[PDB]
Amino acid sequence: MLSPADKTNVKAAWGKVGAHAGEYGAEALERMFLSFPTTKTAFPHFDLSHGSAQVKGHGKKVADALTNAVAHVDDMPNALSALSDLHAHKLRVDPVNFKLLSHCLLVTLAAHLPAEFTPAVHASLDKFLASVSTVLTSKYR
Amino acid sequence: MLSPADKTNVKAAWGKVGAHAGEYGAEALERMFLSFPTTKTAFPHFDLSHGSAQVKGHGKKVADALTNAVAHVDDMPNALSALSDLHAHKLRVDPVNFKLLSHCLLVTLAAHLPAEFTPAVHASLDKFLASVSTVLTSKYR
Amino acid sequence: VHLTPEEKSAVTALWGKVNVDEVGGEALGRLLVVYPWTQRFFESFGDLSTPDAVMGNPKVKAHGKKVLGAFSDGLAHLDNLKGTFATLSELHCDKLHVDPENFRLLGNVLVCVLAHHFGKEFTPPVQAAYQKVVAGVANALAHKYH
Amino acid sequence: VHLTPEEKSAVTALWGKVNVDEVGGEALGRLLVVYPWTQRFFESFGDLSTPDAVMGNPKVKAHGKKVLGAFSDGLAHLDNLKGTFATLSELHCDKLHVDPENFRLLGNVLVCVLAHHFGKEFTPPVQAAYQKVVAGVANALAHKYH
Ligand code: HEM
Ligand code: HEM
Ligand code: HEM
Ligand code: HEM
User: Fold this and answer.
1) In Å, what is the CA distance from D97 to each residue of B26, B55, B90, C79, D94?
2) What does the record say mutating residue 58 to Y does (chains A, B)?
């Protein structure tokens, strides 16, 4: 459960990301693929070479979905309902992988927001992606 | 989220458990300490030897909170609030351990209730133990 | 893996009483029922909509015996699981795209099944030795992933 | 720890630029603020109720340096982590009673701190080398648990 303070922190930090979202989503993906290679089994149809257009396109989508969740932080389960059915019923990606991508999103954010990635903020962002992950995984069984 | 068939399967299984609840809780604890020795770090104050009285007593406590939760299966968060508080603010056991004990409770049930541990019932119980766990870790931060 | 002799021998004696056909069928099926997302890899097996259907599926049963058949052969090689399962890891990674986390899950289901079948004989010490074999097998199956 | 030589040089090269005293304190601080349950081990450290209380606590800073000093020392022995950390492993198990998952948590927070400090210089390839390193340190610290 997010606290008022968490929502404030997430809005602030995500606010400074701004129009870098897509770019930061693609980098998270690249980070994940290199640090945790078992995550690649979920993308066999993709070309995963550095600078790949599929990876870039996928980053934007992921980033847009996270921008939506921030715009709907008091109603995330309904705002992400659709994405949640998709993962549970079509994609069927193991849950363990959501933590790995969450970790990588934080690393990317930390790499790009020196001034905003304070401790309290890191704590809030980590609680946020943990909640996003929980919703997207809620209907797996 | 537990479906009605889940609640029905869990209720049936646990009902057969009957007066063996405490004996099975102690058994699961014992299988956990041996199978997953890192879990012993949470009980440096207990005598952990076979058949010791602290494990027995503790098995019953756990087993009773589980009976309570099956009886309040539609209202878990409320029924387990105090235990949820206790784990998050005092004991502060690492969330990762809940999965290990859960698994050992399933092995203990499979072992004692062969006719009742059908695949659908295995599924339901795994889901119930997972929800109990979620509830007991929901206030950690 | 780091298996004590009393451990090595608890594993071996029990496995001698295992009906690999029934046990592999029951393990793979329970995997598909208890963790439904694992059904992705087996779409072409048929109807997997209900536990009953899963459990009665012949391709699931035959697949279970093949899997447990290979597990069985690896138990004669506990000092070299990595070399024994090397080409199997490569295939699972490169041709089949199976997340290793699935191996871990199959392993725990397998431990539930052995318990179900053997009751009292599947004691806490016997179980601790099977958890080590099962993780060791999963680890070896994941070893060549890149 | 299976590390390529280019992985080993990228790790070492960056570590060359780290101020361990300060990074030691940042990482231990953030662990306690982000994963507040980990505070159950430092109740004698006084006030840990808000982030500045934690991050500014002199005992937290002094302990952070102590923790990262030994990590650092392990970076000079990447081929023998297990041996290098064996007495620390025993200690954390038998005296301190620290669950090993805590070593993984710290590992991940350290990677974020390195990325916070170094920015773009902490490239995807460099992070991946650091991930292998922090996992090996965590495994080595856990290895004598029993
Ligand atoms: C923060 C967590 C995640 C979010 C917000 C997210 C969001 C999305 C979105 C918006 C899509 C696009 C679906 C469409 O076309 O409308 C998608 C697809 C997909 N995601 Fe998830 N995703 C997340 C995590 C994951 C992770 C952990 C995995 C597994 C590693 C994953 C694997 C996939 C795959 C394989 C697709 C389909 C890609 C394709 O074939 O084009 N996602 N995700
Ligand atoms: C199935 C999930 C669990 C349930 C339902 C449960 C339930 C309980 C109950 C009823 C108590 C006694 C509280 C009291 O005296 O008022 C307790 C305490 C405790 N639990 Fe949890 N527990 C669970 C999982 C775990 C986890 C996995 C561990 C860590 C390995 C754990 C560690 C402890 C510890 C150390 C105590 C205090 C023991 C003592 O000093 O007597 N529990 N739990
Ligand atoms: C003890 C762990 C496991 C072992 C030893 C094992 C072994 C095998 C073997 C021997 C084959 C036959 C390959 C061939 O024909 O050359 C196979 C095929 C396969 N396995 Fe595994 N496996 C394990 C776990 C898993 C699990 C957990 C999954 C996914 C849930 C999985 C998915 C597959 C798939 C998709 C195939 C191909 C089936 C086909 O040809 O249609 N395996 N496995
Ligand atoms: C990189 C991993 C770590 C290393 C290399 C490390 C190393 C050390 C060292 C050198 C000491 C002092 C030894 C002594 O007092 O005799 C120490 C003490 C301690 N460590 Fe670890 N540590 C690590 C991670 C952790 C973390 C994750 C925790 C807990 C969440 C922890 C808890 C403690 C505690 C409680 C002490 C004793 C503090 C006191 O004096 O009151 N350590 N550690």
Assistant:
1) 22, 18, 16, 31, 6
2) In M-Boston/M-Osaka; O(2) affinity down
